[PDB]
Symmetry: D2
Subunit: 149 residues, 4 copies
Amino acid sequence: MTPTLETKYVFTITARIGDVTSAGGVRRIIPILGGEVKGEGISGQVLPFGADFQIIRPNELIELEAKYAFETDDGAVVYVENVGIRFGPVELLRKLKRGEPVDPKVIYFRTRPRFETGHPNYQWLMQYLFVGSAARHADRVVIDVHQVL
Amino acid sequence: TPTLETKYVFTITARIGDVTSAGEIGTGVRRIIPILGGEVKGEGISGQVLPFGADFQIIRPNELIELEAKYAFETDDGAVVYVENVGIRFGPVELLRKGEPVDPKVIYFRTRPRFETGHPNYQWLMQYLFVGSAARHADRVVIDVHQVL
Amino acid sequence: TPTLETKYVFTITARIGDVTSAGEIGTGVRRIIPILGGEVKGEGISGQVLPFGADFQIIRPNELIELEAKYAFETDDGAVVYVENVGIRFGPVELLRKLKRGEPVDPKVIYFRTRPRFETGHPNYQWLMQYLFVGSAARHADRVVIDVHQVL
Amino acid sequence: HMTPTLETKYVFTITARIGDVTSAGEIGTGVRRIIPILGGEVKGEGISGQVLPFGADFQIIRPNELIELEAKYAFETDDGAVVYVENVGIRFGPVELLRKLKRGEPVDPKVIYFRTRPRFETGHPNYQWLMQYLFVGSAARHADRVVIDVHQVL
């Protein structure tokens, strides 16, 4: 019997982004300006600070390393650390890097968000591992967060 | 609803030595568990965990365990893969307290293994995310590795 | 007995914003401190810190603060330097408790040292990645001043 | 206008016995290599310890031969503290001499830039100070060992 893994979609972080700044493989920084969080029991707004600090590998692959927060309706403040990778066929990666729209289903964009809260309700966010499956647009990054069971 | 696809790729069995503890360090007990060896098995994959490295753990006040293991394996065809395996182990307090034998299907024990190699046939190990589902026994940790698609 | 030589090289000054707190992780209190501008300054390296990134912190039960600031400046040459500044702030607990209420405490009487690491592709500031650096820092209400010293 | 100053004080030396290089290869950013830590000693005033027989330095050699170090190990003192060490830094120098070091050939440590930031974690009451200061290490690479002179940043 081959080993099995079960996961569960729980919620979606949409993060609004701004212009990129590049250091020169290549280090670049993309500011997080806002956004929202939506799922069963989760409703909150991404806070207007933080950035994704990225490395572009020589093969056009993107190491993502974002640190931000969100605040739920409850008053729970949740620190987000979202680490991962975006890859796929090279010509499609050059389109995104331009701002030109690409179908997210054709791209590989997977992350591991970690969460930190002291809020008693959202302690579960620290007791499980999560995998994100994301989508890149010019103005936003849509992350579908799945709970590893 | 958003969906996520994964697939079993291989199992890492890391043999572990004696626990060394640094004590309580403000934020959870720092403990270290030497890696002595082991095996890596899967489709077309056959290798040995090299005899060095450690798991560096933090135990939180609540018996939850943050894991951070850094070690390596070598496949039969000569690929050397550096492994950074970061995770959490959790469950009923009594069972966590139990080096007595416990059934793994009650413990939450999931990790994110991240791989580095130069071997042409394992490049895919750095181009995907992976999730581990692990089981702890007294002499070894058995880690089933699933590729996130 | 072994010796260590260092050289003061330049001063950072990251203008920080309102504090946002996430609370107890069981292992300390997590807080975030945006960085919205400010200046780097010294010999042959003048520049501006950029209005993004933040200080992400843990406050230990004993009230020591471990800092991890990730931010960037751009110099006159047009170099973009990415900075990661990891450090600690400690002292007798009374003085530390004044430092959040936003009270002027003389930086000499408080221990605030960091290790700032740099990344550039710019061929003129390549030396930033070839040495280790130590910040000796100081805490204010609106700003934070960072004396960068090169380890030789 | 007064040029800021930094004061340090030498506190102790860590001598780590190192094993054979395992190399994972080119990772697109440099070459990943791993060097097992076999033992060693810690010594200074009011600190005397033995480096425990486990751990490793996880390294990246950049294409200019700069080495990024990231060593994780532990020592135990004679009076019963266990201290976890995370030692992160760089080794650089003239390429010929870096290559000499790779071949296990003796080089004078003065011509090699070899500096790190050691970070300690311990529960032991007497060594609590190890997590209350920043430290800088000035080190030396030999064929069989690494010698880090640890300085407390004041």
